[PDB]
Amino acid sequence: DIVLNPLGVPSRMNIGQILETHLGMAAKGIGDKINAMLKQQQEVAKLREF
Amino acid sequence: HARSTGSYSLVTQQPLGGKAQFGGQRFGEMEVWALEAYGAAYTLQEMLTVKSDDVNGRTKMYKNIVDGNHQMEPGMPESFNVLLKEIRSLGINIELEDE
Amino acid sequence: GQNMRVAFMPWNGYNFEDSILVSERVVQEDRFTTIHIQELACVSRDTKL
Amino acid sequence: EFDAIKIALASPDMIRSWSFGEVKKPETINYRTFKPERDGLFCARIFGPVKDYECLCGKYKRLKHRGVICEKCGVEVTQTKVRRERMGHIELASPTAHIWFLKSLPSRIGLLLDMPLRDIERVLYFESYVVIEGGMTNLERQQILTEEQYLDALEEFGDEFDAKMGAEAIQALLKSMDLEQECEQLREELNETNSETKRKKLTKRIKLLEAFVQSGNKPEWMILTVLPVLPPDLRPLVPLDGGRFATSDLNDLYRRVINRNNRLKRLLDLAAPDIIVRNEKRMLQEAVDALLDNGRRGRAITGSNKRPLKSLADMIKGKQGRFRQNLLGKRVDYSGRSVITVGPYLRLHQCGLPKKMALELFKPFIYGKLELRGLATTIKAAKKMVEREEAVVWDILDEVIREHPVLLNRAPTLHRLGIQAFEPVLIEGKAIQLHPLVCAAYNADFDGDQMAVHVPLTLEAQLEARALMMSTNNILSPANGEPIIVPSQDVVLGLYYMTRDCVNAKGEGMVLTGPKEAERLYRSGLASLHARVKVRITEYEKDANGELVAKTSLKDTTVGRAILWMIVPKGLPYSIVNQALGKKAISKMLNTCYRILGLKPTVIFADQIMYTGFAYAARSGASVGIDDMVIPEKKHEIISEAEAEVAEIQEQFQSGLVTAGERYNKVIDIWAAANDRVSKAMMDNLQTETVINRDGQEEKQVSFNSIYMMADSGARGSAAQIRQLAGMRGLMAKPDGSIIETPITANFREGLNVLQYFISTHGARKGLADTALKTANSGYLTRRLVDVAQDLVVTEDDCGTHEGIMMTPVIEGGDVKEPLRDRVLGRVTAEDVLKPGTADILVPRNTLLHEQWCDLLEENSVDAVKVRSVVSCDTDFGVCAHCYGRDLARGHIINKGEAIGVIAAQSIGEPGTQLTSSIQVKNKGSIKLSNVKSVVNSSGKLVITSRNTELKLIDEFGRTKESYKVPYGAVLAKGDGEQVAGGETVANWDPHTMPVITEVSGFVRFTDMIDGQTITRQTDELTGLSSLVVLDSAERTAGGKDLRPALKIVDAQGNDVLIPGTDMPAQYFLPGKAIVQLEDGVQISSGDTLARIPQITGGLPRVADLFEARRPKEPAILAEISGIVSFGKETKGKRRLVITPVDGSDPYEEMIPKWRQLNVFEGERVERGDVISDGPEAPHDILRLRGVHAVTRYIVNEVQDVYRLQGVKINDKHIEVIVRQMLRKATIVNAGSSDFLEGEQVEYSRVKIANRELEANGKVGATYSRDLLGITKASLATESFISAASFQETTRVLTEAAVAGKRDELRGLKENVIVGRLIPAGTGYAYHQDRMRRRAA
Amino acid sequence: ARVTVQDAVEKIGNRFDLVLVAARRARQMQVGGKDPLVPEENDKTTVIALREIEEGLINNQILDVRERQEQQEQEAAEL
DNA sequence: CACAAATCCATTGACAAAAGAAGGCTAAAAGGGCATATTCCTTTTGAATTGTCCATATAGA
DNA sequence: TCTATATGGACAATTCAAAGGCGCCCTTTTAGCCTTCTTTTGTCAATGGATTTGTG
Ligand SMILES: [Mg+2]
Ligand SMILES: [Zn+2]
Ligand SMILES: [Zn+2]
């Protein structure tokens, strides 16, 4: 959705945007996994445990 | 924002502020030096006489620009002449030696 | 604001200095489309005429 | 039309001449039917009609009656803009002192009457009387009388006596004062007395009376009798919408003056008591005063809201007066601004400019075009057509746009490249797309920076925006010839990622048939973009004199360099893209393409390099991530070690072994060491840690760490910022500047805890608060600069001088810090250089030392060059094109016309923001001595007896590479011509020591030496060797206070040893604390030490202070004149220095303090310009003693030292042109033939032309003493008064020119910009020369 | 045309006199008195002036000469 | 190619609207006159000048 | 020779200019207003010749 620039981090030194890109990716990954559990709609046992 | 010709200040017949009064940009000292550093003495002249202040030349410029003729007539900016009446309204006398 | 899938790569200079290269699905999902509300007024005054 | 502005005092008769009628009452308008109420301040009768061609009583309402004054209400039916020019006056009941000529710091009414300011105000406040026309009555003329004294006198003297008071008294004095008589008096008294303060006041007053008689003015025109009123449309009472009026402030001030005036007329009609009319005349003096200038005399009468009224002098003055606000920098039509953005498809002669702004800015053009093509019958129809935005206005806009430059602009317009005219491209949107190679010039981020697009209306201005100001014409910075179209940040990443080389990619070592199938091997997916390869490139060389020689050969390269060679245009070599191509290399590539192929190939190659850089940077996906920031695996170990070591220092401070400060610096050096180990470890792990393997086991090349490539290309960031991300970051210091003793040991990949972060915040905010405020200053340095070199303009093709300067490489203590090629590149030689052996004749005199001549100079090892300079120029009022050099940008020599004062000031000023015990030879060389009066010490060495013996290291080439300073009485193991090699101390001395080593040997004799009066006897316990310490003057007793201990050596016969070269006795007096080594009776040998003696601002106040030329606090007192030194009185302070030349007169005498050290010895000899003490020099003194070239080399080397320390480049030409505008004045030493006062300070140009014309005849030229003014005083003491009034304080300049009747003949750039006409600089220079010939043909 | 005015400056020296020459000649072409020499590539009168100037077929001397010629013909309109 | 008729340009004349004035009016604007006693207002930096000591040179004692 | 007496010279307070980019009552006099009047300035409608085709 957006293409930021690589060359902005080493010079400004806000490494926050990179760690927060990575953890946001992790979070939206759990979002994709739970959406996939709710499309097959298998059981709420598997959802609860996940 | 953009200003071809709009409404003009009261005491010194120049354009107004920014985008609420529909007002031209400021072409301050630093840009004047940046034109003096080139040779643009024609650009600079229409920049501070016709486009801005010369209250007869600027209507007569709009007429030329619509007649397909890009001339100009330089004249004396109105704000300089305000300057003369304000100095001369001190006790000072500042006139133009004519020759 | 809203969070959206970014990527840190030079993309042919459309994100050159600090510029950003938003894709059309962000403008298309109406996700940064805000709503601005102005107040015009038409005062009706009394003149000697 | 006109050609000069005259300024003088306005008389009563003149003030009634401008005016059209007295303003009698204070009424402004009629509050019910808002008519100009006659006859008050807005009087239709006096100042004109209110609507065009309509009387006020409505009787006449048509242009049929143009010019007829009505009968009923008397309003001249004329255009209402006459309302804006017709002035009026007020008949002041009592006179009233014009404040400017009474309160300006040197009071003009004061020094004209030779009367102190306090007494004049005591007369003006109606406190004390003053005498006039004393007659035969036993009183002075100026004799101030109080009430008591007058009351005594009048009882006795009803006749032959008179004493006015207040403004009438001052008027009577200025009217009775005769100027010629008192002027002759002052001249005869100048003939009489010689006191510096007295003579200064005399010459000031005599200069004033000369000005005031030569002029047509009069004294009693100062005290106003008739005051003027401004017009009524420059002080308007316009009604803002809402029934609220919005008056000016001058309406208030005039209304008050006229009320107090009318009241005073009444108080004189009722025949009032005295105290009431005195009070009224004081109130009127205050009111006229607060009108002419408010806040000057006493406190400001406050406006209605709560605020000082803006009286007239506040109209003119300040950053917001007419001069700087409405007259130099105008608002402008045909202009707009919106956000800028990238748009990389652009060619760099164009700027994407939105359709909507372009249709708004170009409406006159569109209307003319539509009614020309007939699509719209009338102009109004065309108007509604473009407002409805039909399909034809966009075609008409695309056609009246086509070849028409616009002038983009960015807000802080530091240097002259921040206004460049582009050719618009009509682009959807509302953001002005700006080309990506242009950001370095404009200095633009694309995170919100707005830009202004102005328009060249006329045909000449389109031509100047195309030729002069276009974006493909200034790709070289005018401050130094280097390019300013350097590829910046993504593009260098793209090139650095193309033109690199892995060790084993696809296609390792396959022979390609050219760049073409390198591109196909890449795009097809067979080779990697950097996989080393053999190709057949066919470069060209420009070997033949203007021809291109072809040639082909299998260069060893990679697929990337091979894909990049398809752009290098036809002249360059292949070894220019066969390296890594960082950022220095790519700016170098563009610079050499400019210098070989001219301009057009450099521009088209700039674009091709942008496009290919962007493309391959995109293809690389050089992304950054949290795992590209490699922490060393040895960082916790390093920190643990340094921490345990600092605990050891804690113990050794707890055990009393170490002092507090020593313990501090101990810990601080130990953290600096550990920090540098962590940094060096992260870099050794970060740069090469890619280990690879080609058909074998393992090799390692430079790495592909994404953050490392971004730091190694030169794209973003240095090794410092990489250090902070990987290695531990910094030693953050507290706002004191006292560096903390525990660094922020954690980097930004780990987390700074709360303490470490809170300590980072100190420096973060200090940096932000600086870079906010460095723009306050450096916006004022450039303003003063470009307002001192206003008028300095290249005005002759040559002035034919032989003067110059000696351009040589700066050698800042050993290591040379700037070659001679950069210094003498582009400047014109003044004397023909000779070959090193002299060997020849070599480069002619007036040649221009462009690149190839720097090649001839660098090949043959030229030692130094003398090259013409602006501060040794003989042109009048300008700087000829040969005594200037070339430019930087447009590589050829300076054009006869161009305005170099301005680009000089801008170049020196726009980088303002970017600013804040024994000699050891370094490399090979042969030692070379300089000004060395050495002597062999008793050990056999070489000791130098001249404080100014600089120690050189002339290599065998024929040049200098080392230059150290050898103090007085050093001891050199080597000498002149003794070859040496690196890591070799050749010099030895001690700084804390100061020996008195003589030139003869023999017995040491205590001459005129007594214990207690000349010496102390105080044995040191742990040594026992006695030293009868030679103390100074006021410390010793009184009988010997004039008895000085002198050392003088002799032989066994007792007779005085004869010095080598002199028959003089060498009796040497010793200073205080001149503790002697060997006493009397102990003979000293050759070169033997007699006795010992005991013993920075920078950034851009250092540059501000080298330009304003402020004197330092302890100057270094130079040697006024050449000869011998002696002491005669030694002082009622102090110490007295006497310099006695060999033959000339010697009444010299200088009251040196004895408190300062005296470098010279009492029995030594010094040249003028030699230091007779230590500490900084002063620039005034350097100018007075060693010419202009000394001071100009001083100012240049100092301020270039600043700019070089900060790593900025500025060609020395610009500092030399500012230095020229500093020393433009010269005091007439003694008026040779005619015709000046010998304390007068005339422009150097004028006395130069004057004595040139007089020496052209038989008479005697005027002797002139060159001055040196600071830049503020230099710009504020000019021939032209408008360009001094505009700059800074306007009150003094206007009042001084007013009394002096000064006349402004424009002949400048600031004046012709004020007065609205062509600058006499570039394209206007032709107009002004043709005008000067059109006058006086 | 036109990107740069380099060659037009190499023909008419001094780089400001270029501006004046091109502006005079473009006024001639624009105010309806004359007619381009070099074939116009759909240029405004400005770039045509600079294109003229590049070929060496117009400068300040040629402009003076043509002006004096055409003002002498108007004297030769004396009949 | 001349003689008989329809279609144009000019004055008579009266007639209505419109404006310049004049008077009659009324709102408003400007004077004038008040008499137990009333007693004094509410951020620095640098340069240049001006008023202040100091060196000192000379003149009398 | 010593002191003073002042004078010209070196020193310390004081002020000024700079510091960035987009109460009332009555009385009288005056002037704005309105309304009619009169003379001016256009408009409505006649009445004659000089100018323009038709016929044989
Ligand atoms: Mg920015
Ligand atoms: Zn009138
Ligand atoms: Zn010169």
Side-chain angles (χ1 to χ4, degrees), chain D residues 437-457:
Chain D
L437 293 173
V438 162
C439 300
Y442 282 113
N443 189 6
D445 292 328
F446 289 153
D447 62 0
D449 295 328
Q450 297 174 1
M451 281 182 63
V453 298
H454 296 282
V455 175
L457 291 170

Side-chain angles (χ1 to χ4, degrees), chain D residues 912-928:
Chain D
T913 304
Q914 304 182 4
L915 302 186
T916 296
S917 177
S918 297
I919 287 175
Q920 191 70 41
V921 70
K922 185 173 181 177
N923 292 107
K924 188 267 183 185
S926 177
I927 301 301
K928 174 67 172 66

Side-chain angles (χ1 to χ4, degrees), chain B residues 90, chain D residues 26 28 41 90 92 227-230 235 247-261 283-284 286-295 299-304 307-315:
Chain B
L90 298 172
Chain D
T28 46
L41 268 50
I90 307 169
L92 291 179
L227 184 143
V229 305
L230 197 61
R235 63 188 168 94
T247 188
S248 185
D249 291 319
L250 292 164
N251 288 319
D252 186 356
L253 297 178
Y254 286 116
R255 203 186 68 200
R256 179 169 299 164
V257 180
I258 296 179
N259 285 323
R260 299 190 185 184
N261 188 10
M283 292 164 63
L284 186 148
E286 172 179 359
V288 174
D289 195 3
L291 187 271
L292 298 173
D293 193 0
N294 189 347
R299 69 178 182 271
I301 62 181
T302 61
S304 176
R307 178 162 299 193
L309 298 163
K310 183 179 285 192
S311 60
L312 299 178
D314 288 329
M315 294 288 109

Side-chain angles (χ1 to χ4, degrees), chain D residues 1190-1314:
Chain D
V1191 67
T1192 192
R1193 188 181 299 113
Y1194 174 71
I1195 299 301
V1196 167
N1197 295 126
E1198 294 292 328
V1199 59
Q1200 284 300 108
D1201 192 356
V1202 179
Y1203 284 144
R1204 177 184 300 114
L1205 174 67
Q1206 189 60 252
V1208 183
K1209 292 180 69 65
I1210 291 169
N1211 200 353
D1212 299 336
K1213 298 179 176 66
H1214 309 301
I1215 305 165
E1216 295 184 357
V1217 43
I1218 298 306
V1219 170
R1220 171 170 179 168
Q1221 294 297 331
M1222 278 169 62
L1223 51 86
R1224 190 178 62 241
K1225 291 288 179 69
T1227 58
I1228 306 294
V1229 179
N1230 52 3
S1233 176
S1234 293
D1235 47 0
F1236 298 99
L1237 288 75
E1238 68 94 22
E1240 181 180 358
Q1241 195 179 11
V1242 68
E1243 182 176 2
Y1244 168 75
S1245 175
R1246 293 184 185 280
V1247 76
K1248 191 259 188 183
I1249 54 88
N1251 68 0
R1252 184 178 64 195
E1253 180 180 2
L1254 297 182
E1255 194 276 334
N1257 295 321
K1259 290 183 178 179
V1260 59
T1263 65
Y1264 57 89
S1265 177
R1266 188 77 68 89
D1267 278 337
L1268 182 142
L1269 279 73
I1271 61 177
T1272 178
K1273 298 298 181 185
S1275 65
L1276 201 65
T1278 314
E1279 292 289 327
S1280 182
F1281 74 92
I1282 288 173
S1283 173
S1286 297
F1287 172 76
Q1288 190 183 354
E1289 66 276 19
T1290 304
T1291 296
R1292 295 181 184 178
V1293 174
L1294 272 303
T1295 180
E1296 180 59 25
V1299 305
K1302 194 181 265 81
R1303 177 178 186 270
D1304 188 1
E1305 186 164 359
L1306 291 171
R1307 197 175 71 247
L1309 278 72
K1310 191 83 79 64
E1311 289 85 0
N1312 297 312
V1313 173
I1314 303 297

Side-chain angles (χ1 to χ4, degrees), chain D residues 237-395:
Chain D
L237 187 133
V238 63
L240 50 83
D241 295 329
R244 296 282 284 157
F245 285 99
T247 188
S248 185
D249 291 319
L250 292 164
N251 288 319
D252 186 356
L253 297 178
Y254 286 116
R255 203 186 68 200
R256 179 169 299 164
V257 180
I258 296 179
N259 285 323
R260 299 190 185 184
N261 188 10
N262 293 322
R263 182 186 304 121
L264 196 147
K265 291 177 182 177
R266 273 183 280 165
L267 285 174
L268 295 177
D269 280 335
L270 279 73
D274 285 326
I275 188 167
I276 289 177
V277 302
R278 289 179 180 174
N279 188 6
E280 182 59 24
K281 297 182 185 181
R282 283 202 292 263
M283 292 164 63
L284 186 148
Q285 172 65 46
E286 172 179 359
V288 174
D289 195 3
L291 187 271
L292 298 173
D293 193 0
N294 189 347
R296 176 65 63 86
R297 186 173 184 178
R299 69 178 182 271
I301 62 181
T302 61
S304 176
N305 306 116
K306 289 305 290 183
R307 178 162 299 193
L309 298 163
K310 183 179 285 192
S311 60
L312 299 178
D314 288 329
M315 294 288 109
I316 298 167
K317 286 165 65 178
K319 180 172 181 175
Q320 294 184 356
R322 291 290 177 270
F323 275 116
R324 280 174 58 180
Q325 173 70 41
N326 287 324
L327 190 55
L328 281 170
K330 298 177 171 68
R331 292 276 182 184
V332 166
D333 286 334
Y334 306 101
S335 67
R337 69 193 297 155
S338 74
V339 182
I340 69 174
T341 195
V342 188
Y345 53 85
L346 297 172
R347 309 281 306 284
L348 82 165
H349 62 78
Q350 52 190 359
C351 65
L353 172 136
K355 301 177 87 73
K356 310 174 189 178
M357 284 166 60
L359 180 142
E360 178 63 29
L361 298 161
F362 295 110
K363 292 177 85 70
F365 303 89
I366 287 172
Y367 295 169
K369 187 70 73 177
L370 298 176
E371 76 179 9
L372 173 63
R373 300 183 186 272
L375 291 76
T377 308
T378 180
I379 194 67
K380 303 293 290 184
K383 175 182 176 179
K384 289 181 73 174
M385 284 180 65
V386 311
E387 181 179 2
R388 301 177 65 193
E389 293 181 354
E390 295 186 357
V392 301
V393 300
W394 302 109
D395 295 330

Side-chain angles (χ1 to χ4, degrees), chain D residues 798-799 801 868-869 872-875 879-880 882-884:
Chain D
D798 188 353
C799 66
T801 61
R868 294 170 68 179
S869 181
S872 71
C873 187
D874 283 337
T875 296
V879 172
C880 68
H882 274 86
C883 292
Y884 180 75

